[PDB]
Design a protein around this ligand. Structure first.
Ligand SMILES: Nc1ncnc2c1ncn2[C@@H]1O[C@H](COP(=O)(O)OP(=O)(O)NP(=O)(O)O)[C@@H](O)[C@H]1O
Ligand SMILES: [Ca+2]
Ligand SMILES: [Ca+2]
Ligand SMILES: [Mg+2]
Lengths: 363, 154
């Protein structure tokens, strides 16, 4: 019996089989319907037909907000991508911490009542990433398309009072890039154009080590500019947008949020932990998720945490090269262990206890 | 947020510890562990926790990951047992081995009631405590190791 591991990101589904070193199916967590108002398309194929569809994400900031479309995503994952019968596979799902409890209750209900899985578990994403890095103690910064979260973990146990969450992540950065590109006279507005700008962001953006210095460099000459060919063949140029876009992670006021930036959420999380473990957290800051892939982000985090921390504190940022998939990989490892599977909810347990059982089994 | 309304409301609870203690009862490697002073060692082999024979204790394959349980009498009571649990990660170990070693270290900690203090020991970064476990000349690194448990997705 092979378990399935499905990391349902706000932006991307990562799905596959426990024991594999990578997800075999990675595709956009989108449902598309005709822009002019069968009847819908899912995932890669919706992306392929983007020219005629309006695209919608069923997960916003880590929370499922369109359950009918989420069911379409899960159905597509099992039957069209992985081509498995879900009733034959114990299934590991994932979630951001600090989600409302009803989200995993309904996940559990649909997995058992609609998909008839034999067993399932919902794991916290940051814990999977820490194990994927070979650690039991550290502080994870996970940033995807919907959520940025910090989870300090000591001896294998997440410290709930110190968990931090910011509902600011890759989708907000894409939207901000769309906005600032209007300053050059470009107009990216539609759901299809959002996906184009997402690609520009992924290919060309970076985190400046010193933002104000970089702004001056960009005005002094064209040395930082890059060009990009749109699907219609138009070639555009971008300059300081390359680094102003992810600067938002450090300065959330760029999009009108009063929140602390990611360097400050990380520091604040460490400071909520018992004094004697803080050195181990500072030395084990593990980054995971696609929004941690900007060139320069680890060096900027190192610099900013150094400025906040005690002057003698040893600080290390760990940035695994495959960190777009670290959550999934940690799930593949844990779901390969019989003792971890012993904790999973079985179909019989669900039949007898209902959705509330998820809170008593999944930690 | 509102922790009590959220999916982390039961973290840190007695219930979390109870469920994890139960899971740890399902690993054969822990049966009989930590019952007398000494050092017990296991190697991860394709996701499984496999005992290392005593005659090899102190010799570690650079390609592998291990769990080392050191049982000792604490200063507080010469007739009771306390524990340091070290997980040793060879310079060439693969991600599945190191992640399993980490998870299973927590599980052994659970099995022993939380008492073990955990130490992550990367080859070349071993702590003073780890270096003190083996008699002079006892700590030796060996070339090679067992094959990963992962299937490589092409
Ligand atoms: N090289 C890159 N540079 C910057 N952003 C990137 C890069 N690659 C991917 N991203 C962004 O990372 C996000 C997708 O990352 P991913 O970790 O799969 O998120 P997710 O798990 O779907 N979302 P979440 O629910 O927040 O965990 C999108 O916003 C991408 O545009
Ligand atoms: Ca090996
Ligand atoms: Ca312990
Ligand atoms: Mg994610």
């Amino acid at each position: 019996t092979t378990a399935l591991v499905c990391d349902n990101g706000s932006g991307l589904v990562k799905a596959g089989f426990a024991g594999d070193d990578a997800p075999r199916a990675v595709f956009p967590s989108i449902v598309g319907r005709p822009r002019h108002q069968k009847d819908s398309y899912v995932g890669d194929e919706a992306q392929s037909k983007r020219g005629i569809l309006t695209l919608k994400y069923p997960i916003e900031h880590g929370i499922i907000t369109n359950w009918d479309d989420m069911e379409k995503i899960w159905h597509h994952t099992f039957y069209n991508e992985l081509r498995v019968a879900p009733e034959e596979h114990p299934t590991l799902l994932t979630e951001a911490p600090l989600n409302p409890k009803a989200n995993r209750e309904k996940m559990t209900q649909i997995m058992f009542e609609t998909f008839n899985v034999p067993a399932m578990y919902v794991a916290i994403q940051a814990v999977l990433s820490l194990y994927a890095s070979g650690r039991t103690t550290g502080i994870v910064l996970d940033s995807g398309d919907g959520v940025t979260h910090n989870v300090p973990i000591y001896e294998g146990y997440a410290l709930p009072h110190a968990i931090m969450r910011l509902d600011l992540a890759g989708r907000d950065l894409t939207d901000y890039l769309m906005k600032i590109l209007t300053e050059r006279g470009y107009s990216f507005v539609t759901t299809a154009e959002r996906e184009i700008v997402r690609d520009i962001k992924e290919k060309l953006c970076y985190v400046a080590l010193d933002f104000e210095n970089e702004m001056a460099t960009a005005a002094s000459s064209s040395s930082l500019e890059k060009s990009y060919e749109l699907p219609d063949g138009q070639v555009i140029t971008i300059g300081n947008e390359r680094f102003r876009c992810p600067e938002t992670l450090f300065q959330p006021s760029f999009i009108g949020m009063e929140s602390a930036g990611i360097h400050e959420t990380t520091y604040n999380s460490i400071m909520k932990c018992d004094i004697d473990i803080r050195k181990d957290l500072y030395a084990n800051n593990v980054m995971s998720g696609g929004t941690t892939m900007y060139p320069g982000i680890a060096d900027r985090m190192q610099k900013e945490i150094t400025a906040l921390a005690p002057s003698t504190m040893k600080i290390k940022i760990i940035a695994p090269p495959e960190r777009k998939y670290s959550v999934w990989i940690g799930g593949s490892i844990l779901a390969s262990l019989s003792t971890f599977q012993q904790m999973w909810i079985t179909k019989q347990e669900y039949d007898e206890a209902g959705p509330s059982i998820v809170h008593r089994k999944c930690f | 947020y509102n922790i009590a309304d959220s999916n982390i409301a039961n973290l840190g609870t007695e219930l979390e510890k109870k469920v994890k203690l139960e899971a740890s009862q399902h690993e054969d490697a822990w049966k009989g562990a930590g019952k007398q002073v000494g050092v017990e060692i296991w190697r991860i082999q394709q996701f499984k926790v496999v005992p290392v024979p005593k005659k090899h204790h102190g010799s570690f394959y650079t390609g592998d990951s291990y769990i080392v349980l050191s049982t000792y009498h604490p200063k507080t009571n010469p007739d009771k047992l306390a524990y340091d649990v070290h997980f040793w990660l060879g310079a060439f170990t693969t991600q599945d081995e190191a992640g399993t070693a980490a998870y299973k270290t927590v599980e052994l900690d659970d099995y022993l009631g939380g008492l073990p203090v955990q130490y992550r020991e990367v080859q070349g970064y071993e702590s003073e405590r780890f270096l003190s476990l083996f008699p002079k000349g006892g700590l030796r690194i060996l070339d090679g190791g067992v094959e990963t448990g992962f299937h490589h997705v092409e």
